[PDB]
Design a protein around this ligand. Structure first.
Ligand SMILES: [Ca+2]
Ligand SMILES: [Ca+2]
Ligand SMILES: [Ca+2]
Ligand SMILES: [Ca+2]
Ligand SMILES: [Ca+2]
Ligand SMILES: [Ca+2]
Ligand SMILES: [Ca+2]
Ligand SMILES: [Ca+2]
Ligand SMILES: [Cl-]
Ligand SMILES: [Cl-]
Lengths: 249, 253, 254, 250, 252, 249
């Protein structure tokens, strides 16, 4: 798929396994990983030999959120900021529109973008000790990357607002209770792969159209709020509140 | 309301009891049951002597889904196909816009369309051992009849995706917890009747307009996706995948 | 500073505003003044930059018991007042949906009718152990237009919204939190809501206010689809024999 | 034919249906029976596979002069007839918006009030040289709810729709065509709309029917946004003194 | 007046209100005081039961020649004023959209930028023979977010709304009526608008006000869809070096 | 931009000239031109050095629509059909979301997909004796390319309905009278290039943000009906009506 180092795509028949691949840095999102995720979904859509994906992270985390270095660049580099905003748009719309089922295997913390990738998936398996969180607000940023943007399709709006506003950690058990996750698994990668291979035996036209039927609701909610969210996040990158916090850490 | 035998309608004052009536086939859907459902909602809306309904199934099930013979005919006959699509649309739009409250008494399995009727009701009572399921995808069909379509109004979209794609049976308890049903009942038809009867004592104009206020959301969601959904299921009927799954399922010697 | 009447006390504590529904003797029931004040408050908070967060609660044992029977009787008899209350009813919903600052509810006691709609329109909700939510509009001959059943489908299953709205069932604190109609049960909801708002106040402003906005776009889209219909239908129920007859019994206080 | 009343004549001519509003002594003003007919018709057309296209027109000199004053005074005095008429008005609008077959309008004379709404809901419109469109709801103390102004923004500037709905301006045949409220000025709108429909009849059915649905999605979204409120507000009109007073004189 | 600043005169003539932008020396260009008054007024019109129709026009030669340059210059430097002018910008748009009474514009001279937006947001528009409409936002480094181009798609072709919001080209009185941006060309548009509003005053209140809401539902939907994005972007525009450059030149 | 031969892209500073390139065939649409078109718009969005585009056709026509051999192929080939549908969607979604202003130089007939691309552009110049037309229906296909689908944003729904159903040729003068085009031109290509050039001088963030504000209204329309529309054009590739008409052509 012409991915970079930080995104390993492996082929097993009509399955694709996607592994976020910065395990030493807990899959924190740098420019390279970000651009990779922007491009990947349309590519899956356009490859007829792919019929399903699994997304997971290498090592202990799914993704711990933004890379501090990447973040500090974003607050001083306008060209980089404009590109990240385009790509950000393409991840959300890439996954919203993606042809094939995507099964998430949350092996570890999924924070920020990680947490948004999980809300944009079709079925989610999560490890007992893993959690979801979005700490955008606590760090000085509008949560635009897809988490809070998509959470009201999954949970109550009250709950969405509280977790977006305060960076609440959502445990594996709680996420399943809420419908932010489908199953707690001991081995979420394995359980994910078996659910995707199960889906691969089903009639293709039926599988692909039914995902599109449901994702229309997702796409409606995205077109309503995404341009404003991205625009506002862009303004937050240049706030003293953000610049200060992202310098300390 | 000029229903065919497979939809029994009983009046009890201002109440209508709607019983799906092919009990020996687990009330599975044939053309007559389908057509009747398509016409029924508008005729209730226009009968000012009706102000509430209960819908249930005769015998052990609420509805086991499509009659395999009906489904096989649908893969072969383009005219019948186009008809079923029109009538399917009318069931969904018909319920969405139905003037009177509709209380489901799910007496056993509500599968495929049955499960969609339950999603389009206002209040659901469900028996302890009944379940909800939509096995459209397992069988080669796009789930358009109104279940998965409207499930996201009741439940997490992630959970709607999973159940639409895997055809999981949803127990009465799991359903009540999820908000796909309202109460578990020893006698769901008795409890539905009582529920509807309380609603009949209440001021009509408040009851009717308040349903309308809440169903606008349902209508907004259906308008976004029903046409596409129906067109896709129209194509599903003609696929080799579906022909081969249904030609086995309909082969009964 | 916000030209509120007696029936809405508003208190400043730094950048926090504490809003108290203030008719304790009537269990904070809605009369015209309380309705007008609620209509005008939210824009005035948005425009006060010294304000950055708000807590809303009730004086005495109740959050709000809903409609003042005297007022409701007057509404079934006065077409001018009716048209005004519809206008102000749109402003409460629109004002809260569009309000710049996070609003945390402290449901100290029953939140009924307009009461529970103010709750459904808040951002974070703390509820007392013995408090409950209810909307008895339909039992009383009125369409539930206030913002309750109107907004409920964004928190809970539509099936459940249809039941609770058609029957007026009471939703206990434990049940509300189980359902997503509230965030937390509290021994002391006012203290807990105040601490929650004060914790938010420490967060970067532009991030908090923008994030409320992103989330409330979904709420505004839902309100815009049904609000004018809902309020127009409620207008009509004030003039029904059903309501006129029910509200005459209720407004009969010797 | 379709169990219509006398007030609505439906004629078949192969796969075409010709719908003629039928109270020419009253300029096809709308009474209850015509109104109920209009609500039932479209779903029945939709459900008749031997029907593939419609033309709609008026008997005699008018297309339709709008609201029969007898009906309207009756509507102002009886809550149950109000509730039924709102219910049916809803069905006319959704009926035509959801209708399977192409509907071609032949506007033979004035199309006023509801009649002008029938035109806006049609797919192609031929209008006689001397004919006009108007919606007089407001000047009569009624909210303009039953499809006209409600639908006009899909045809014309919102500014123009607002002015015409508030002032009840007459829109001439030429002027209708200049705005896109009508497709062609016709000497014989009945005949020209009949040939239009026969032309569409020869085209591939599935292409024709699906294309209508594609464009009417935009119509349906605009209606769904506003119809419930407009009908509710018009129900309130029937009951005001301003209306009771104006309709008494008329 | 209605607590308007001097920059907005409101005169009462029975149930009628005449709203007059009142900085003729600067051709009614938009400063901060005018902007605030425009934000506050609409809700106050809606809440005054003794008002039932309104006309809006400009003192002197122009209806309004868009932003005061001095004002736009502050907006490039003061962040608090920026956030405030964005808040009130929403209120002009949402307040006009939701306003109870019909509003009839008398475009007596050029309506530029915000002026052109107030016209788009009106119910019925009368325009002088030598007047015109324009939005030069883009030529000046600003996103056109005030409610002009935001709203133009409900009146005209999207292709045309794009041409004019991009090129900033002027729309003559005659061309505006032809497109659907104006209702009537007038010799004396103040007088034609006043007469139009008076006719409307004679009509049954409930029918007028409801019919306005029915139609404005479409404007409200179009605004909700793009306003928050639009104002956020125009906000980013104010801090751009393109705008700082352009505006510093124009105010010196 | 890795574009096929059938789509020429030329650079002139920040300008991109897009010339549809099958002149001997009146730039009629085959699979490769179709794939090129689907892939183009995101690549333009992502090339920061492109800031405006002009689209036109080589030779005497803008585009005469579907390639007959291509359409016959589509009637008989399941996979080719599903692919053309995916790409058709990207053409529409790519144009609607394209960052940069696109100016159309309609140099001759723009028929079918031709007038759909015109409909999706932001400013249009049309030559004196050119016309817009969509004959999808008369050949047996639901008019889903984006033409009729976009028209109600430009013109009365009544006229859209008529032009779509009857395949009416819309003259250059009528197109401008309705606002299906902006100007009649002696040399549409020069006037377009000059207009695009004028735009390139304007402040970029104002230009690009303003396009987005406006195209949100386009994107709302497209999202409401595109999937139904593309699914119905798929069903019509498979009708006897279409097969007969295409085969005898
Ligand atoms: Ca982010
Ligand atoms: Ca039978
Ligand atoms: Ca039979
Ligand atoms: Ca089915
Ligand atoms: Ca109320
Ligand atoms: Ca009427
Ligand atoms: Ca501006
Ligand atoms: Ca095509
Ligand atoms: Cl495989
Ligand atoms: Cl919408």
């Amino acid at each position: 798929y012409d991915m970079p180092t930080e995104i390993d795509v492996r082929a097993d028949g009509a399955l694709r396994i996607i592994t976020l691949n910065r395990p030493d840095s807990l899959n924190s999102v740098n420019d390279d990983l970000h651009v990779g995720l922007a491009r990947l979904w349309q590519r899956l859509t356009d490859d007829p030999t792919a019929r399903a994906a699994v997304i997971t992270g290498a090592g202990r985390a799914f993704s711990a959120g933004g890379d501090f270095g990447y973040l500090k660049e974003l607050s001083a580099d306008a060209d980089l900021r404009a590109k990240t905003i385009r790509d950000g748009r393409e991840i959300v719309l890439g996954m919203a529109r993606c042809r094939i089922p995507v099964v998430a295997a949350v092996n570890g913390p999924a924070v920020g973008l990680g947490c948004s990738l999980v809300a944009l998936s079709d079925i989610v398996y999560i490890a007992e000790n893993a959690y979801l969180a979005d700490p955008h607000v606590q760090v000085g940023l509008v949560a635009a990357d897809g988490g809070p943007l998509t959470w009201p399709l999954h949970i109550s709006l009250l709950l969405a607002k509280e977790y977006a506003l305060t960076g609440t950690r959502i445990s594996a058990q709680r996420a399943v209770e809420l419908g932010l996750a489908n199953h707690v698994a001991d081995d979420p990668v394995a359980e994910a792969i078996a659910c995707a291979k199960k889906i691969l035996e089903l009639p293709q036209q039926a599988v692909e159209s039914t995902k599109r039927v449901l994702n229309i609701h997702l796409e409606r909610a995205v077109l309503a709020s995404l341009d404003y969210a991205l625009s506002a996040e862009s303004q937050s990158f240049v706030t003293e509140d953000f610049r200060s916090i992202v310098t300390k850490l």
